[PDB]
Symmetry: C3
Subunit: 217 residues, 3 copies
C-alpha cells in the first residue's frame, strides 16, 4: 500500500475524508506515519506538526526527543523534526499558524513556503514570505536559523535561548515567537518563557491554543 495509499492530508481531503483527525499517510521513502489532518480550517488539507491545547504535556525537552517527536494523539504533541523534514524536503508546502487566547480571540498567520533541513543541517528553517494574518509576522525574524534545544545550543546568542525562554525553536538572538514555550495560561510575569507570539499578544501572554500546520502549495 505505499503506492495505493495517500501522501498528504490534502490527498485525503480529496478522497472524501471530511472530518479532522488522525490518518496515516506515506512519506516519500514509503515510511508510514500517522498524522493529524486538519480538514476544517481555511480550506482544509493541513497536516499538523505541533499542537498546544491544555499544557498537559511538557515541551521543555532535549535534542533526541525533538528529533523523534513526543506527546499524545489525544492532546498536545510535536511530530518530530525528522518527520517534519520528511514532509517538506520535496516540494513546496505552505504554513499556517493558528492561535487562540483565553478570551476566545482567534488569530492566525500564513506563509508562502516552509521547509526544514535534515539533522546534518541542524533542522534549518527556510521560511517563505509572509502572506496575511491577524497575529502579525513573528516568524520571518527566524528565517535561516538552526533549531536549538536546551542541550544543544545553535542560536546566535552568547547565552542559551532555549534555557532562557524555556523551550525549543529556531532561536536567533533570541526570539520573536516561542510556540514550544511553557503553558503559562494567559498573562505572566516571567519574561517570554510562554507560548508567545510578539506581534500577537506580546512577550507576556501565553495562548490557550497553538497549532502549526502544512499543506502542499
Amino acid at each position: 500500500p505505499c503506492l495505493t495509499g495517500p501522501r498528504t492530508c490534502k490527498d485525503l481531503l480529496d478522497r472524501g475524508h471530511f472530518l479532522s483527525g488522525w490518518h496515516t499517510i506515506y512519506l516519500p521513502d514509503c515510511r508510514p506515519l500517522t498524522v493529524l489532518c486538519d480538514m476544517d480550517t481555511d480550506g482544509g488539507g493541513w497536516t499538523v506538526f505541533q499542537r498546544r491545547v491544555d499544557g498537559s504535556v511538557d515541551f521543555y525537552r532535549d535534542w533526541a526527543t525533538y528529533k523523534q517527536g513526543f506527546g499524545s494523539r489525544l492532546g498536545e504533541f510535536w511530530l518530530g523534526n525528522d518527520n517534519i523534514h520528511a514532509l517538506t524536503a520535496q516540494g513546496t508546502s505552505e504554513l499556517r499558524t493558528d492561535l487562540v487566547d483565553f478570551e476566545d480571540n482567534y488569530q492566525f498567520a500564513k506563509y508562502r513556503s516552509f521547509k526544514v533541513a535534515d539533522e546534518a543541517e541542524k533542522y534549518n528553517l527556510v521560511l517563505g514570505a509572509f502572506v496575511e494574518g491577524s497575529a502579525g509576522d513573528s516568524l520571518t525574524f527566524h528565517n535561516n536559523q538552526s533549531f536549538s534545544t536546551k542541550d544543544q545550543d545553535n542560536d546566535l546568542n552568547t547565552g542559551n535561548c532555549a534555557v532562557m525562554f524555556q523551550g525549543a525553536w529556531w532561536y536567533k538572538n533570541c526570539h520573536t515567537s516561542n510556540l514550544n514555550g511553557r503553558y503559562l495560561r494567559g498573562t505572566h510575569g516571567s519574561f517570554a518563557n510562554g507560548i508567545n507570539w510578539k506581534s500577537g499578544k506580546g512577550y507576556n501572554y501565553s495562548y490557550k491554543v497553538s497549532e502549526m500546520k502544512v499543506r502542499p502549495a
Copy 2:
C-alpha cells in the same frame, strides 16, 4: 442499496462483536460502503452512532449548505457527520434517536424518540420524526417534523427572513422549537433563543455545555 451482509453494519453490531469502548470505529452503510463513525458504547446500554456533538465551543457551527452537506468539525471535538451521510445512515430502516444534553452545572438530560430519518438533498433533507418516547428534556420535537433543514445560505422555514440568521445555526426550521447547532454561548445569555437551546431543557436563555445526537437500530 440494501443491508451489507459482509461487515459491521452499525455501532450496534460492533458492540455485539465485543468492541466495548466508546470510540471512532468504521462501519458499512446499506450501500455496504465504509465511513468512520463515533460509537457510543456506554449509554442507555450502548450501541449508538453519533452524528452530532458539541462540547467546548472549539468549532464554528454557523456554516453554509455545502459544508453541512458533507459534514465538518473534528473527530477530537465538535463535529457534524454531514447530511448525505446522515441520510444514508438512518433512512434505510427503523432506527431510534437519542439526544444527550448537559448543563454547565454538570447535570444530565435526554430524549429517546421512536424513529428518525432525513430524506435526501433532492428532497431538502426533510426530517421524518416519530413518536417521542421518554426523556428528561421534554422538547418532544413534534414540530420540525416534515420540515426542510435550513442553513444561512438558503431559506425554507415558517418565517419570512432567515430563520438561520435570526438565530445563528442550522436546523429543520415560526420559527424554532430547539436550536442545537446554534452558537456555543456559554450558559444563560441575554440574547434570545440563539444559544444551544433545547426548549423545555433550559428554555431560550440557557445554551448547554455538552450535546450529542445519536442513533441505534430501534
Copy 3:
C-alpha cells in the same frame, strides 16, 4: 508478524502516545492505549481517570468486559488485563496527578491478575520506588469485588461502602476506581484515593494504571 505489546510498538518507531492495536497471547487483536511518553515509554494503560465524566461504580459484567471511552476515562476489562499479564512478568506503574497539577507515581517489580475462575485475583511484586508511597501491597493476594459480587474480608460490602471496585479486603488503602470527588472531600475514603499519597480525603485529578514487560 506484528506487535504484541506497547513496548514492541515503541521499538518500531511509534513515538506518540495513543490508541494502537496489539495481539494478545492467542492472537486476538486488541486496541489499547499506549503511553509512549512516561518513564521510558512502552506502557499499556488499562485504567484512566481524567475528568469524572464516566460512571465507575459498576458491576462484575461491566468490569469484566471493560467500559468507557478511548476519548477519555476507561477500564480495559478484567479479561483483557489477565490476557495482557498471563505469563512473562510485566511491571506496573501507577501515575497520579493532583488538582494543583503535581505528579506522584508508584512502580512495582511485577503485576498479574488471575482469570475469572480465580476471580481476577491480585498477584503483585515488590514495591521498587515512587513519590506516592506504597498503597497496593496491602492488597496482595485478594480477589476482586464489585457491588454485586462481594469477595472482600468485610462482614459488609466494601464496594458499596466506598463506591468503587477493587481487590477489596477490609477494606482498602487505595481506591482508584472510586468516585471522582474533585480535590479534598469530607466523606471518608470514597474518592480516587491513595492512602500513602494524599490520604483518604483527597481525590486526584488524573489517575492511570499501566503495564510494561519487565
